[PDB]
Design a protein around this ligand. Structure first.
Ligand SMILES: Nc1ncnc2c1ncn2[C@@H]1O[C@H](COP(=O)(O)OP(=O)(O)OP(=O)(O)O)[C@@H](O)[C@H]1O
Ligand SMILES: OC[C@H]1O[C@H](O)[C@H](O)[C@@H](O)[C@@H]1O
Ligand SMILES: [Mg+2]
Ligand SMILES: [Mg+2]
Ligand SMILES: [Mg+2]
Ligand SMILES: [Mg+2]
Lengths: 500, 500, 500, 500
């Protein structure tokens, strides 16, 4: 045994731990099927009246929100509307000029949500909504300075507001916050009317001229934006015309929505179901809180790393268990926990004696962005050798050549687990509504927004693969196109405000 | 307001524009009566000597041509004669074997008039007449190759020549072109002898053996052909025997002719009226240039779409205003202008941003054939849903379901306007000559040739209806039969050549 | 037995004959597989050196032409070039402004090929090429009148010439006509240089300024045009990037071409293969004369109606047997022969006593356009009842209600036979070159031009179905997109002239 | 010429433009020498009294600031002090426990400077300093919550304040802002006392307990931190003991400072020079505003891209010309301007028709971070092929394979130009003070902080190379070590506060 043979014995120990992790992470079709079936069962429960002791702030299971849109655009909608979009790492304000030909011209200003609003439980509703109103002034000064200069007399501006949190919507115009998720801890807005808080701050800042017309989700805005764009009006002689079914968000969090029959939403008051069916409003866009799927954990492929994020690092433990396996914030956090744990086992970061000596950004939660993971996974031979080091050097964590390949294997296992689980709600929705066979012919479109699905170098293809593996089978995959709703939330909110 | 309600609001706007057009197009009996009366007044003027400053190339009003036929056949005429027929979208050569029993056996060769002769003002008389002579050689090679092989010694062939243009006829044998109409722009034949140009080209091509015997119109040939065929010799005990009164053309253009008393044609030289009355030639077949009726526009139900065709798209602006409302070329063009105008209003072709993006065949004049209109109008429920799309797809213009019904309404309004106006000259002629009461009993026949009246799925019945609405009343309609002179122009020219 | 029961007994006899025909026409997967395999065998033979006694004018089998393009565009090509396109029912001249962004702006003039050039064996090379030169003058007068006015001094204009006939190409600049097909009988151009004849006539007409730069086929132009347009440059993170493989023509005739490895074309001189491989010219676009597939008839599903067209009605008996089953000219002719034969059997046109009394346009060959078939097939319930009559009325053939449904069944059987046979060459080409598996991922595009594939209300979907039935299987169909190369031949020739 | 040959001709055009740019960017030793010599001349002028008409807000040339530190640490300094650090993309607060053994334990909180303070001229002193005070409260709540809870009675906290802007320092305790640079436009703080504004806001927010003890630069803090750490106390028998000479910042901006003899600072009042020399204070740490070197542009290798940044995009045109060639903000901006200009020339982004169609983040200034450049440059073969696309995809700019290599060449040319120019001030300082020969033996240390020097995968080695190329020669490079002052500004300010 030379030093090189002794080193190989160590490398084999490292490899076994990494392979064990990779196998714990991979989703096998058997679980993909248990999950699709369970997802559908929870979807039916999510439409049902609550039992005694249940509420929305505390529910568990897979709740659904009956957003009152009740239809979809065809691209002919026209007009200029404002849109606000809150809830990722950032906030955006758009001015969307809908042209009536399946396109729009969008102006945009965007900013990061300041950490003053995210790291402290003592942050109030006035700090968050005061922020949004100040950014709204900045937007108006750049794109519509005249309306701002002429307000209060200039009027109205119609604004749609996308707010990416579960909202107990009662009307397209308004609803209340059910809970904060995804990084916000601002407790005094839970139960309050989201539009009311924003609208009051807009007036407080000098813009009584801007009226918030509609409150929507990101999933809904995405679906509607997707519907507005492309064509879906081809010739009936081209042989097949597609239809939008499902909207997705794969960003800091994960969600989607779909068109559903109004007569099946048993929790909606019957009087409202009757009022709407009488006008031909046979369908609603339902926000399925995918993130909450299996919060009780009867089927998801949970490992110890997911337990740690959910119980110790997350802002809302016990909720949004699906997101913790799928969305961008947790793809990042899962790798960080693995690297720290393989430090403790003495397998990767062998040079440190012990955890307290690790780089501070490695031990601090959420400092490993899914952006680094994107580069870690795409890197091929020379990327892995040289760039993987640069990518982790930016997290102050220098590594060896052999360590870098082991880290890449962990990253691919993490993103694969997510991409396959991410297919569960798409298969489950298409199957529940029989989207694939409600019509003899016509393709199924899924309009997905969010930076993980748009940029992660692997999701577009891994979802298609996973859909084929799920109960949809190859035949279902053949009907189903994953398209990107790039301007997704912005256009969607503008359309919601147009609808009012 | 859901997307579906917003879409209905748009559909209502579309409908209002289409209904406004349909109402502008419909001819009400009040105008049908003003027009019948005006038509008769212009017919009397059309027989009168001209005033100083008037000529035939430039006249206005409703000119008539005193074709020198002076009588009608009874079906006993026999012999084999050639016939040439120029002036629609095509040209035909026939060899008609008249059998003497109200029937004939017709051989035919036909060809399209090449665009080389239609789209350029620099086309000469030698190109048009050279064309006719070359097609004549082709005809002879197929049906009478022996006469061609034996010519110059084989002789004579007698040919009748139907030339569908106003001709200043001086004798059945010849006359000059008054103007070009209906698509021809060959200026150097205006004022020239039509037979002379054709006869010279026949010799130039090697056929000195063929003599053009008679020059006729299509209206005249149709009347005579109609008279030749059926019976009109039934028993006097069958209770009632009919007589031919009016011939019609409803093809690329529109015209007709009728039998008139020679003593009323005040512009004909008196010496000629005397020469003919002395031989019992009490009547002449008069070509009424229906197409020119109301060229000055005092009564026709003119809309902006007709103004555009007459001033911008037509080959002879200011003339043939009636045809522009009635004939096949303009049924086609009127729809095209409406669709382009409803594009500009944002009502039908809503997907284009603006006119320059429309299919090139939609913006190009005369590319919308009345043939497409025929199918657009006949289509019932499933035809409208599926075939209307195919019909416009052939014009490269894909449409929506709701657009297709709106287009069909416009098409029916266009063909109805034409069919009712088309009744004006038939009512006006029968009334002026008192065809309905010159005899106690005996039916009135109108022998109409032309593809619009023969195939358009609506003219046969719409004219009968319109005749009943006009001053003829139901009582006049009861005397009047619309029959189709199917082999119309061919037989007619053969008879004209037989007459010489 | 009442009259109605006796009539049903007759209808059953009619139905049996129609069903027998429909079954003779349907292509079963077993034959679709024999044909794909045979097509591939003949394709290999088509690349081989000839045997003694063989030439190109007379070959039989499935010849291929090694067009010297040797590559494909990526959309960045820019410049303004002229293009001429001869050989369908018409001729087109374009001026194509290539912009370098996968789009172009095309100006166009088009005209029908006059019958003077099609119905007579005594037509010479000077009449056909004189025609093309005259239409070229007309084009220049409308789009580039200044170049024409300034020529001879203004120069050069670069023109690509698409000539849809087999051409024994020796260089992209020129080659000779192998045979006339598809309606032309002009024997004295066979064996002559196609460009030389056109170029001389352009000078004869006054345009020494226009140089014909490249001679191409329609199949080649279509492939290149298809390649030029869309993108095929998406992100490698979108998950899959497509590549053009096969170009198609489904118009008056049928053909296609594909990219092939130069080292496999064994008949090309080795010295030329070496000259080209040394510059990286690893592939050529090969015109596969699909029309000639199985001219000897060992596998095609031939019936008596196809025998009649090939031996009695066609301009080139014994050749282009595949086209006679597939292309637009013969979809039309096959129905006509069936209707005449069912007249002779006393089943459809029961009112005539015998063939000589049938409408002359029914007994005359090629008067039944595939355009009528398009409408006959698309028509649903009310279309069949009312429009089928109008469509055949335009062929002067009035029918009964029961006759109309029987005719529609025959039409669908005819177009299905064609659509399935039409898939044979696409499956055969993709399989021979392993287009489906030469790369792990990336879609396969087929760029098809021609009015049958673009407008016939059934081909887009019937080909996709047939491809799945053929040896490609569903898995091959999943890679394969049928797209329409709408401006196909025009752009292609402009690119060929750009290439020179 | 095949499509592939035509494409190569285009690629050659692209390459020539890229090579021309690369050659314009490369710094040749001849200029490196002109610049070193000029830098020294301007350094002498920078110590001189001003001429009439000169001030500090407007100076030009290379000003120096005589920070009143007057000495350096040896690692024995002990105590716990707070430190604030403002002025990059972010702001940091530290609590540094100096231990007296060349090490310290640092606690840290950091946040991004909100855009509310950077994009608007109407931002006031109260918004910037209010921000710093609020972040200070957050820091105290996490690391010293007891002092905050006990204040006002708990006291004092001693805070050092690093403020990375030129400051007209009069005492280590305070000075005024000379100008804003590097992204700030807050005009009403220019001329005001920097400590006074911060100190007042700390009291306003509830922390009268924290006293700002010292105001320093980042360059000074870095030098002192560097001096505090390692050893520099080795045995005199180890053969050679090093000494710190120069501190550097290579972050969003670029600067450094060095120890200089007090008797040479001719602009300092003589009375102050005498007061200090009498106590043995023979040296001062002088901030050399490297960024301002050659603001008048007599020697820097200026190209058109640098002119655009300086005159159109920068917050302070005419100043800090050296930084615009060297620092992280402009490495980013220079590439962006090149890519847009090569779009205009039609060489890289060939698919767009024109600038208005480019991705909005490409045309927006400063959206291309030097972070992307880091990855673009490090990428080797497979990194360039796949990751370069991901890196630009994050700027919404998809590219081709050939485009990616051309972009990488531009990036390496940009970072090389910077790295070589970046050596000018280090060579110039060591040469001016004869750091290399003031002692027979002992190494020269340069302590550089800042993320470009710490992470850019190329600076550590390119500076060493450039130093050898400059007048220092290989012999000077052999004395000179580039080390990283990682905790640099934080420790430095804590030491400045310890010094008071
Ligand atoms: N290129 C990338 N590769 C991988 N992950 C990325 C990339 N860019 C952003 N992300 C992830 O996406 C998150 C931002 O999500 P996104 O841009 O979709 O905003 P969002 O719509 O506001 O999110 P949400 O809708 O859930 O609130 C980041 O925190 C990071 O985790
Ligand atoms: O137009 C389609 C095809 O028609 C004929 O079959 C020709 O042989 C062929 O070269 C051409 O491409
Ligand atoms: Mg979002
Ligand atoms: Mg006629
Ligand atoms: Mg063609
Ligand atoms: Mg700094």
């Amino acid at each position: 045994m030379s030093f090189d043979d002794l080193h190989k014995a160590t490398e084999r120990a490292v490899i076994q731990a990494v392979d064990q992790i990779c196998d714990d992470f991979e989703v096998t079709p058997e679980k993909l099927d248990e999950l699709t079936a369970y997802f559908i069962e929870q979807m039916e429960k999510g439409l049902a009246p609550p039992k005694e002791g249940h509420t929305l702030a505390s529910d568990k299971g897979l709740p659904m929100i009956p957003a009152f849109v009740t239809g979809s655009p065809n691209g002919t909608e026209r007009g200029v509307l404002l849109a606000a979009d809150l809830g990722g790492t950032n906030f955006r304000i758009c001015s969307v000029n809908l042209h009536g030909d399946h396109t729009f011209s969008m102006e945009q200003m965007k900013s990061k949500i300041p950490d003053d609003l995210l790291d402290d439980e003592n942050v109030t509703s006035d700090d968050l909504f005061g922020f949004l109103a100040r950014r709204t002034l900045a937007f108006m000064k750049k794109y519509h300075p005249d309306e701002l200069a002429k307000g209060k007399d200039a009027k109205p501006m119609k604004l749609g507001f996308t707010f990416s949190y579960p909202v107990d919507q009662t009307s397209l115009n308004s609803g209340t916050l059910i809970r904060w998720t995804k990084g916000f801890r601002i407790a005094d807005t839970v139960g309050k009317d989201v539009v009311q808080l924003y609208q009051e701050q807009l007036s407080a800042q000098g813009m009584p001229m801007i009226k918030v017309v509609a409150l929507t989700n990101d999933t809904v805005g995405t679906y509607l934006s997707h519907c507005y764009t492309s064509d879906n009006t081809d010739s009936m002689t081209s042989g097949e015309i597609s239809e939008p079914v499902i909207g997705c968000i794969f960003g800091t969090g994960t969600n989607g929505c779909y068109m559903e029959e109004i007569n099946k939403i048993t929790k909606l008051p019957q009087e409202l179901r009757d009022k709407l069916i009488k006008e031909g409003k046979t369908h609603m866009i339902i926000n399925v809180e995918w993130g909450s799927f299996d919060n009780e954990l009867k089927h998801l492929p949970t490992t110890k790393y997911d337990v740690v994020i959910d119980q110790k690092l997350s802002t809302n433990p016990g909720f949004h268990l699906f997101e913790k396996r799928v969305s961008g914030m947790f793809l990042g956090e899962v790798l960080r926990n693995i690297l720290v744990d393989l430090h403790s086992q003495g397998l990767l970061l062998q040079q440190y004696r012990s955890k307290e000596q690790l780089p501070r950004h490695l031990t601090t939660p959420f400092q490993l962005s899914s952006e680094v993971l994107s580069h870690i996974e795409i890197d091929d031979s020379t990327g892995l050798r040289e760039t993987e080091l640069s990518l982790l050097q930016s997290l102050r964590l220098p590594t060896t050549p052999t360590e870098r390949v082991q880290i890449q294997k962990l990253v691919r296992a993490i993103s694969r687990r997510s991409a396959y689980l991410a297919a569960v709600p798409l298969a489950a929705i298409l199957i529940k509504t029989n989207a694939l066979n409600k019509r003899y012919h016509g393709e199924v479109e899924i309009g997905c927004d969010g930076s993980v699905v748009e940029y992660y170098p692997g999701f577009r293809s891994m979802l298609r693969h996973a859909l084929a593996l799920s109960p949809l089978g190859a035949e279902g995959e053949r009907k189903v196109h994953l398209k990107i709703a790039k301007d997704g939330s912005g256009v969607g909110a503008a359309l919601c405000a147009l609808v009012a």
